[PDB]
Symmetry: C2
Subunit: 207 residues, 2 copies
Amino acid sequence: MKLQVAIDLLSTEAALELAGKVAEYVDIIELGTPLIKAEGLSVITAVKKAHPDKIVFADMKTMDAGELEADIAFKAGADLVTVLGSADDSTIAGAVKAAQAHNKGVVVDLIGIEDKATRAQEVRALGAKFVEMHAGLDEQAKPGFDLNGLLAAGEKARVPFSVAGGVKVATIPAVQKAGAEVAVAGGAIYGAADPAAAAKELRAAIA
Amino acid sequence: MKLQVAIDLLSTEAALELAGKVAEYVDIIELGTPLIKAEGLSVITAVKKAHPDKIVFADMKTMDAGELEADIAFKAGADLVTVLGSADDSTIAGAVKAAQAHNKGVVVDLIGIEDKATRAQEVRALGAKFVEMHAGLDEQAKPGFDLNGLLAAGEKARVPFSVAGGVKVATIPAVQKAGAEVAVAGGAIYGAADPAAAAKELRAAIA
Ligand SMILES: [Cl-]
Ligand SMILES: [Mg+2]
Ligand SMILES: [Mg+2]
């Protein structure tokens, strides 16, 4: 299982500083949706330039014009781009076409999807590399939020998947046991007084 | 009925040039989702600065962290921001809270929703100023695409709504008859060799 850092910050400066401190402990560096909307595609280019041998994940969360959004993100340096599972099949298909053209990949973010396992199988057929069993910050804030719902969906999906939903060192084992290909950590890393140590500790928990 | 131009061009330079040519004929200037992801929030600020006398619509298509995305868009100069209807109710609520705090508004984009009429009523009950009966570019590219489906949903929901999806001079009358408070024109304007003339014609079609 790989470790992915979700840089859900608001400036390129902040993203670069964080990436510099945790890069050595992660396999994938994600530029969050708010970060991309804040700075534009240049943040993707800057991070890839500073970490050329790391997998750069652009969380576009594309909802329409799949081929176009995927293409511009890939051209900007992204190795992986996200398209929402809620998007039309043709939108996901378009993003996949762009991914094939660049020998890169599309990750379908299943955030907000009620039938995650079912949708996962459907988008896998469209060409997604893997799907993200994702619970956003607003969903995580709801009382009673349980990470096991995402893990259960991932197991039933039978599609390569990543898990994003407030993952911490304590839950890394459960995420890996569910068969996740990637464990995503956001707040556990950027919200810590010592981001570098947080990333290192998350990495150490991986079997 | 008001006229909104959806500037989905990919550069701030091109967006400002287009805005300057059509501002006189429109009530709302929209910065499209791909444009915001390409250039970042700076494009919202640049457009509002050049057109303080126009309602600036930031098509964020927020899917998570409703309050956060609404906040940064409003801070950048947007008067209205979009949140996806497929987002969690709490995400829409978060955006609505930010809008209330800034004395601005949230528009819920119903793109990709099968039963737009029902969701329209649900999100209006969450505080949306109005909903956008929206059909994306990928959906419109499918043979047989019909605009009347969006109008039907708008008429049925009985909630303030706008229409976006291939709107042209020929369909303006139908959009207005359906009761739309705003008609959104994208390609009909920015795809024209003469955007000014295109916008002028669209405006002339409004009763
Ligand atoms: Cl590197
Ligand atoms: Mg993400
Ligand atoms: Mg738009």
